[PDB]
Design a protein around this ligand. Sequence first.
Ligand SMILES: [C-]#[N+][C@@H]1[C@@H]2c3c([nH]c4ccccc34)C(C)(C)[C@H]2CC[C@@]1(C)CC
Ligand SMILES: O=C(O)CCC(=O)C(=O)O
Ligand SMILES: [Cl-]
Ligand SMILES: [Fe+2]
Length: 277
Amino acid sequence: ALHFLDINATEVKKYPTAIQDIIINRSFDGMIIRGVFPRDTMEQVARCLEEGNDGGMKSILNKNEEFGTKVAQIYGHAIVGQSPDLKDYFASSAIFRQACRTMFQGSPDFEEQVESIFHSLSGLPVEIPTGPEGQTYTPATIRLLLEGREIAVHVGNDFLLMPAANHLKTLLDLSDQLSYFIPLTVPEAGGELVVYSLEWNPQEYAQMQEYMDDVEFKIKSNQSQSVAYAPGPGDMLLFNGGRYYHRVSEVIGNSPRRTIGGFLAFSKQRDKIYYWS
Ligand SMILES: [C-]#[N+][C@@H]1[C@@H]2c3c([nH]c4ccccc34)C(C)(C)[C@H]2CC[C@@]1(C)CC
Ligand SMILES: O=C(O)CCC(=O)C(=O)O
Ligand SMILES: [Cl-]
Ligand SMILES: [Fe+2]
């Protein structure tokens, strides 16, 4: 069974070892952190994406039509499924950061608030990784799930074994990568993070549709227990997506599910938190 804490964002400094407790000690598996961003800020950002005045965010929208209903539309390239050079990824990452910064209008700033949370939950400095030639990684991508669309089952630690993570790998501690996301908008029904009790195993691909099908088989071959979560707008769900297989259930109704999220992990020497998408 999976164990998620649930606290208000005001309390995050009282859980200074929370990230260590999830990744290293495994004393629990995730957290719902309520009101990390105000509801106003989330609505504002959602409007910016609706109305088009999004600081250039729509210029880096990846519809991912060649994968159908099993993925989301992603603003900015995610690290998943990129060429090891990451040329396109770094181009969109740069745009994502300035666009995100623009839409949040320091109310509060996305990166500052997210870093503040991760800092309070670890007592560590928090940074966005840097590429071989100084290129910024993106701190997040925005995931848009339209009606009928879901996010196929997968697990995060597989991503660190993909060619696109070749640089990241060198910066990171080999421990579990956590996932985080914050809903900007929630759907009328469905669109729940469903986490399975099945654990990723290092003793058991890189092409994407091939990967998704490989995991869906692995999920159907085990049929293990699951729990569903549906955090509200502005709530951060932080959990061990690296270890536990999970998906996002089909979005029911016309209201799209918009999340801003990514991943975080310890640096090589466990003296820093990196976060990215
Ligand atoms: C959606 N989504 C992302 C991952 C993703 C998948 N397949 C894709 C194909 C093309 C672009 C992205 C993906 C999987 C099912 C691994 C998706 C997991 C969730 C992601 C937001 C992770 C960056
Ligand atoms: O809902 C999202 O944006 C991502 C869901 C997910 O797979 C994760 O949090 O790792
Ligand atoms: Cl993941
Ligand atoms: Fe995930």
